[PDB]
Amino acid sequence: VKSPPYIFSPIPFLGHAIAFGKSPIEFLENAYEKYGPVFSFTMVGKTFTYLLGSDAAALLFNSKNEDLNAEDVYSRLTTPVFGKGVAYDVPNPVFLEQKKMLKSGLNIAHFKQHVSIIEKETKEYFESWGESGEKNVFEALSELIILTASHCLHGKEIRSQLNEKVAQLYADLDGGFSHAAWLLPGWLPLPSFRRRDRAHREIKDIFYKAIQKRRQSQEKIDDILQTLLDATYKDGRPLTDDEVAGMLIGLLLAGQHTSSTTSAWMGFFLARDKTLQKKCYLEQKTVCGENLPPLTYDQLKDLNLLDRCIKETLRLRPPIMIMMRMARTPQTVAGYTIPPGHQVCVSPTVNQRLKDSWVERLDFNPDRYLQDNPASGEKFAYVPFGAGRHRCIGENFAYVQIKTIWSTMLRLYEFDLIDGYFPTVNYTTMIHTPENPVIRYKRR
Amino acid sequence: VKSPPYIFSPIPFLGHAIAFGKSPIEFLENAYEKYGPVFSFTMVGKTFTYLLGSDAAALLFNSKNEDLNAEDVYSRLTTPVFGKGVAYDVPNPVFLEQKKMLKSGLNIAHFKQHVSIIEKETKEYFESWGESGEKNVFEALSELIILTASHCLHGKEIRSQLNEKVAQLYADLDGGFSHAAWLLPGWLPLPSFRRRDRAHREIKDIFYKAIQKRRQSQEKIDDILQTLLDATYKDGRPLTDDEVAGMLIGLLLAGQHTSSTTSAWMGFFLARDKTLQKKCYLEQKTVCGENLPPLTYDQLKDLNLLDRCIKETLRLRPPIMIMMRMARTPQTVAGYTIPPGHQVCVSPTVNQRLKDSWVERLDFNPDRYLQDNPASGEKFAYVPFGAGRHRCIGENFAYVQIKTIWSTMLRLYEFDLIDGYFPTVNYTTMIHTPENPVIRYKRRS
Ligand SMILES: OC[C@H]1O[C@@H]2O[C@H]3[C@H](O)[C@@H](O)[C@@H](O[C@H]4[C@H](O)[C@@H](O)[C@@H](O[C@H]5[C@H](O)[C@@H](O)[C@@H](O[C@H]6[C@H](O)[C@@H](O)[C@@H](O[C@H]7[C@H](O)[C@@H](O)[C@@H](O[C@H]8[C@H](O)[C@@H](O)[C@@H](O[C@H]1[C@H](O)[C@H]2O)O[C@@H]8CO)O[C@@H]7CO)O[C@@H]6CO)O[C@@H]5CO)O[C@@H]4CO)O[C@@H]3CO
Ligand SMILES: OC[C@H]1O[C@@H]2O[C@H]3[C@H](O)[C@@H](O)[C@@H](O[C@H]4[C@H](O)[C@@H](O)[C@@H](O[C@H]5[C@H](O)[C@@H](O)[C@@H](O[C@H]6[C@H](O)[C@@H](O)[C@@H](O[C@H]7[C@H](O)[C@@H](O)[C@@H](O[C@H]8[C@H](O)[C@@H](O)[C@@H](O[C@H]1[C@H](O)[C@H]2O)O[C@@H]8CO)O[C@@H]7CO)O[C@@H]6CO)O[C@@H]5CO)O[C@@H]4CO)O[C@@H]3CO
Ligand code: HEM
Ligand code: HEM
Ligand SMILES: CC(=O)N1CCN(c2ccc(OC[C@H]3CO[C@](Cn4ccnc4)(c4ccc(Cl)cc4Cl)O3)cc2)CC1
Ligand SMILES: CC(=O)N1CCN(c2ccc(OC[C@H]3CO[C@](Cn4ccnc4)(c4ccc(Cl)cc4Cl)O3)cc2)CC1
């Protein structure tokens, strides 16, 4: 019985809050060098054990929620946003069943509807950008993906309900994913806290309309919303309008920022490497045809450089930078015993550029997978959508959304850095955004 | 006409204060990577331009004080501590004459007196350490250096006055060297300013009577104090007691924490590398004889290995991390022009560790000066004592003090890391101290 190596700190309560908050990746890498794959440190009165590399990460991924708990650590910020009865407000096994319902709605038949739907929105959004200029790509992508995600994961009913003042209510909901919502108790009246809670009530209320609007129309519509309204537990109990609305919010959030971010980054990687940008466009012609017809799901499967470009963007910029659990029981990894109380953590980001197992780690090189790599060489070195019980379900949909958008975007425009500026990473938010994400764009 | 590359910060007033504050060398080397030898950034509403590498630092080192001025940047810290009419409170030509006088005291005749003074102080101090144990070297060293530096630089009369009270007065003065004193206006009253001011008066008062008393006795004492009492500007004008008192405070502050931090680090470099440590002890025997007799200045010149260990310590841990100037007129380096108003900096630490010119840069290797190295291969790669008009005058004394101390310390003890711990650097203060500088020791064979 032995404790993970502990990283002592000068500052009594803050701990490593300032060094880690400043640049978590450098911090975690420096710690990996000095202390190894399993270590502890204190931030803001809380102790964190991190698991780095595949072997160590294995513990968090392979474990039961009974032993490494996700609600204990997420409820604080998620439950106020998504709502009661949904996600981390219920016991895990109840959650899994809701996960299976959402899974059902994410299949090839729906994805075939999604492709053309997203393609139209993309084309129609970018009518405002004209033939050339300099605009913020991430904000454009943020707005577009709020349109595409809603169109696909919510109904046409809800998509037709989106205006300026609804995006504001979504923005209010984003402000729930904060530094402060995690650390500070909910009973404090902060600006962001009231802002968020106001929007939750409103948007639940807006979803109540559209659920009622569809529950009553007879036209057989087969999208994701229908899948939810039709589903049932092992019980045989259908979902309450509340439950449904709860998981509609969870879909909107999961599906929006994780794809805007990633799309935005890939933009800058492709603008920095103009040869690779050219090859992606060439592959568009080679696969789909020189006449560039509207996109099909079946064509997507064959855009393999684009696919690896997305694989590689997610490698160097996974939007979920950290996974967390609470140790409810003692757990053993690498010979260390993590005591109950620690928040146990894995970082895809660190794992995915770890010097031990990636060649030219900081290089944007989608051909790395066409060689030997730990993404197939190792279990948990490449892990942007997690693994085990808490593993993602949006991977196919996120690949469809991003793929369609960038196909359309490369068809519209050639992209370039402004004065060679490659954006750095903003760590002031759990939304990890590119700093000043403005690209130059020529018509193709 | 082009200004240096500038590093932007989101944070409005503070700018890079946190990123620089936390790890300056890390910050500066990453900046070197992205931007090159010359760049500018801002902290707490001040803009800094750094000159990294021999070629760039040549600007600061070669420049005249009118162009790149030190009073403008040092005075707020310095004058309150040393007092008026001294150092950076007077125009630079006046300071040079002052430096010339101090220099004339730092000669071989006095250094020979110093050796046997310092050795005795060292032997006597470390009697409280006993056969073995675990103690805080850095604390022991600063305590010791206060005694040795006073004895050598102030004289026997002042050293006999050194008690618990006076040690506290000096520590209050040290408190004047805060980042706070550099940033915040002097009419504010933090606890530490009051202390600095009160202690400045009480120390001057002590030095006054000490100066008075020797100006009177007939004992022909040939030391650094007498050199000051007998000195004269080109004028013909001798120093007033307040000037003598000033530079005496200057001397103790100067010759104290520079030697104590450097000695402490060397302790840790020697404890980390045990076969190096033993070779140093063998050198003692090989040079001074097997009997290990009392140290002499002459013997110190032939301790080449210990010399290079100090040289190498100063290379990796120079006590003065940043030298600074105010730009009064515009200056040009590497094609860039620094506007008047920027604070222009060099860091010996960064220069002395630069991938480009240092083979295995982070390695403590005293024998690197027996190969081809940039200390002789370049101009300003190795500059722990500065260069140009503001060049240090204390190097020879520093070496005498540290060699004598560590020579003795090696004869007395063998040193070890506690649990393989090597202290990291404390940056929260201007005395760049080692973290938890406790060392293991046992009586040497
Ligand atoms: O000696 C090296 C160390 O010195 C300085 O640390 C001081 C620090 O600045 C102050 O904060 C204070 O420490 C108090 C601390 O704040 C409290 O948390 C508490 O500490 C207790 C721990 O909570 C508890 O876990 C246990 O500690 C044991 C560890 O659990 C166990 O793993 C092991 O620790 C070893 C580490 O695992 C290993 O990594 C290595 O530690 C290195 C550190 O990681 C590194 O940061 C540095 O530490 C410096 C530090 O920077 C200084 O500021 O080097 C270390 C090399 O040793 O080795 C560890 C063993 O040394 O064992 C420990 C038990 O030894 O108990 C502790 C109480 O002991 O109370 C503290 C009250 O002092 O003071 C410290 C000491 O000067
Ligand atoms: O633009 C004119 C500028 O040109 C020269 O600077 C170049 C520099 O020498 C190159 O090294 C390189 O600099 C890179 C830079 O170091 C990186 O940090 C990065 O910068 C991006 C930021 O990371 C990102 O945050 C954002 O910047 C925004 C700021 O965060 C925000 O505060 C605000 O900027 C305000 C400034 O804070 C404020 O001081 C003021 O700035 C003006 C300067 O004071 C003035 O000297 C001049 O700068 C010259 C510079 O001296 C040349 O050497 O004009 C400045 C701006 O007009 O005014 C701002 C208030 O609006 O807004 C910015 C958004 O711009 O984005 C930046 C830029 O991508 O990227 C750089 C790599 O390209 O390039 C620069 C520029 O060519
Ligand atoms: C690039 C896009 C995406 C990435 C990189 C991503 C990443 C992740 C990661 C890392 C996890 C594991 C979290 C943990 O273990 O703590 C996860 C879980 C999950 N994701 Fe995503 N996601 C993306 C898009 C989506 C989409 C579009 C949806 C909705 C269809 C979604 C819904 C979910 C759900 C329901 C979970 C399960 C949470 C749990 O079981 O505790 N994600 N995702
Ligand atoms: C190892 C110990 C020492 C180191 C590393 C050191 C370092 C330095 C450095 C880097 C400078 C240049 C300052 C600048 O340009 O900003 C300097 C200047 C100076 N030092 Fe030292 N020093 C040491 C010991 C001493 C001692 C013992 C004395 C007095 C006996 C002393 C007195 C001075 C003086 C008078 C200056 C000139 C300041 C000026 O002209 O602006 N130093 N020293
Ligand atoms: C203290 C500290 O150092 N830190 C505070 C906590 N910090 C953190 C916060 C949240 C987090 O996230 C995990 C939870 C919350 O969000 C998702 C991630 N997600 C998003 C899309 N797919 C998955 C999620 C799951 C299902 C659904 Cl329906 C929707 C979503 Cl948003 O899992 C991960 C890390 C890490 C940094
Ligand atoms: C904002 C910022 O980034 N920062 C704050 C200011 N920072 C700084 C502060 C002081 C400094 O110091 C140079 C001046 C001050 O002190 C000496 C150094 N000194 C000591 C011994 N030998 C030389 C000195 C010279 C002669 C005599 Cl008589 C006595 C002394 Cl104390 O020169 C150098 C740098 C640099 C870091």
Ligand nearest to the CA of A173: 5
Chain B, nearest residue to A18 by Cα: B18
Unique residue bearing structure tokens 């240096």: B4
Q: How far is CA B81 from the centre of its chain?
A: 16
Chain A, nearest residue to B421 by Cα: A34
- Rounded CA gap, A245 and B205, in Å? 80
CA atoms within 13 A on the CB side of B234: 7
Contact B61, B386 (CB under 8 A): yes
Q: How large is the C-alpha radius of gyration of chain B?
A: 22
Measured at the CA of A236, the angle between CA A235 and CA A238, to 5 degrees, comes to 110
Ligand 1 surroundings by CB, under 6 angstroms: A 3, 5-8, 10, 35; B 419, 421, 424, 435-436
Contact B257, B315 (CB under 8 A): no
Tell how far the Cα of A177 is from the centroid of ligand 5, in angstroms.
Answer: 8
Contact B343, B47 (CB under 8 A): yes
Helices and strands, number each (H, E), in chain B:
19, 10
Give Cβ neighbours of residue A236 (< 8 Å, ≥ 6 apart).
Answer: none
Q: Which CATH class is domain A1-444?
A: mainly alpha
- Rounded CA gap, B356 and B39, in Å? 18
The dihedral region occupied by A15, where left means phi > 0, alpha psi between -120 and 50, and beta the remainder, is left
Beta-bridged to residue A324, according to DSSP, are: A345
Q: How large is the C-alpha radius of gyration of chain A?
A: 22
User: Does A392 count as an annotated binding residue?
Assistant: yes
Q: Are B19 and A22 a contacting pair at CB < 8 A?
A: yes
DSSP state of B232: B
Side chain identity at B403, as an amino acid letter?
K
- Resolution in units of Å: 2.8
Q: How far is CA A229 from the centre of its chain?
A: 25
Ligand 2 atom 53 nearest Cα? B5
Question: Which of B22, B34, B362, B424 would best serve as a mutation to test chain A binding (most A beta carbons within 10 A)?
Answer: B22
Ligand nearest to the CA of A46: 5
SS3 content of chain A, % helix, strand, coil (to 5): 55, 10, 30
Contact B84, B54 (CB under 8 A): no
Q: Where are the domains of chain A?
A: 1-444
SS3 at position A9: coil
- Rounded CA gap, B258 and B430, in Å? 11
DSSP state of B136: E
DSSP state of A326: E
Interface residue B245 vs chain A (CB under 8 A): no
Name the CATH topology of B1-445.
Cytochrome p450 (1.10.630)
User: Which of A 158-217 lie inside 8 A of B, CB atoms?
Assistant: none
Contact A297, A108 (CB under 8 A): yes
- Rounded CA gap, B170 and B172, in Å? 5
Q: Are strands A68-69 and A46-51 parallel, antiparallel or unpaired?
A: unpaired
Q: Considering only CA atoms, which of A138, A161, A176 is closest in space to residue A257?
A: A138
Tell how far the Cα of A261 is from the centroid of ligand 5, in angstroms.
Answer: 14
Q: Are strands A46-51 and A343-346 parallel, antiparallel or unpaired?
A: parallel
DSSP string, B379-431: SSSS-TT--GGG--S-HHHHHHHHHHHHHHHHHHEEEE-STT--PPB--SSSS
